[model samples]
Target: NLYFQGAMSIPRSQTTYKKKEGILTLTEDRKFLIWTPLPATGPPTVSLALDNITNLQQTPPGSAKVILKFTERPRPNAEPGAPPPQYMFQFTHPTDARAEANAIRDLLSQLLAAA
Candidate 1:
């Protein structure tokens, strides 16, 4: 059973993104890749590290993996600067909320730059 669910929200401040869905194919003859039910329009969807994704939860052994459900798609303004949108994820673990918050903050720092 997949318990984790999330959504990427589009804010009025920034834009520019691609969305699609498929088996994030990779080079180097990799046999497997991260799978998400939503569309990923950009390159290599799972280019980021899942190790740092502590919000994801695995339960009921042999269950399907959780998915990231991105519902909005928007374009950036002509200006050279644009802020990053927000991401929402649900979890069942009993971890200190602060840890998750910090992890997300750091991840976004990198994501906003690379994307």
Candidate 2:
């Protein structure tokens, strides 16, 4: 499913997302979350298990961003120790972001609860 269609992800090297890069997709059964770049190829290819997620929400209360918090450490060894495994993405449309982010939040909540 097209869970999200915006970009500006974080928790990587110090890079920032200022554009809609690609599709934030989840399998129909909601088993995984994946990020596919616009060019169909890139370095930060996200492929995460749904069960690995810890939480999902948008910071700043009223921002155009949906950040996914997962279980994996930003670094495998767990360095830095701040906001790791949270793939933060801003919606290209701010207003729609409010609706979109909350919708996905429920999806994650229900799916996790059911499974």
Candidate 3:
């Protein structure tokens, strides 16, 4: 039941993006990271499977930027086995974002280590 508001992300190969604000959350079981944007539908909602992410990182030492690199995960609206892509979320606050992203990264490592 993890949640964050005023987060931002963009498309894989699209040419337009200025960090659309939105809400981002993870399922109770920590199976997926879902993002629902504002200033936007069904396409606006993105569900990213935790297992599919090769590695998650928060760059620049203390930035609130959370990037998800998908290995085998494909776009919900696209074909299976699409090119590996990355989605980054810039959270509302750097302090909270660091904690949130760090904790999530920790849990994801444990969850994925069992794999």
Candidate 4:
């Protein structure tokens, strides 16, 4: 089962002015997923465990993107002071950005409560 599912945009690169369309879904099992259309040489599906999430925020008050910051497992040769990586998901509807962000936060809070 899915808690929420919608289209989202992700920029190809920091310097690029282009964005790619993709689907973002939050499942009842506390699994988050993102995927886009591309070559099938490898699996394009990305699934993230919500349990590791450290923070979630909607930046700039009304931006279309919500950033999900999480704690990553330390790598074999991890840098001592390196910052944690954050995943951003841009909702398709700019006008409903705040609502979308709130929905995600509320769902996350509920999940945490039930745990």
Give me the candidate number with maximum TM-score. 2
Candidate 3, residues 1-115: lDDT per residue as tens digits? 9744322232122111236666666665556766766633444466777677776655655433444333445557885666656776665543455555555556556656655
Tens-digit per-residue lDDT, 74-112, candidate 4: 445768787665556555544654565556656665655
What TM-score should be assigned to candidate 4?
0.57
RMSD each, Å: 15.3, 8.7, 9.1, 7.6
Predicted candidate 2 versus true structure: per-residue lDDT over 8-115, tens digit per residue: 232111112335466565655467766666664664377778767766655555434444344543555676757666676554443455555555665666766766
lDDT of 1 by residue, 1-115 (tens): 6644223321111111233333322223222123232344445434333322323222232334222222212234634464333223332123433343334344444443443
In model 1, the runs with Cα more than 4 Å from the true position are 1-87
Which wins on lDDT, candidate 1 or candidate 2? 2
lDDT of the structure predicted as candidate 4 = 0.48
List the pairs of residues colliding in candidate 3: 41-44
Residue 73 in candidate 4, Cα distance off native in Å: 5.4
Q: Going through the candidates in order, what is the number of backbone clashes in each?
A: 6, 0, 1, 0
Clashing residue pairs in candidate 2 (N, C-alpha, C atoms within 3 angstroms): none
Q: Model 1, residue 41: what's the lDDT?
A: 41
lDDT for 87 (candidate 2): 71
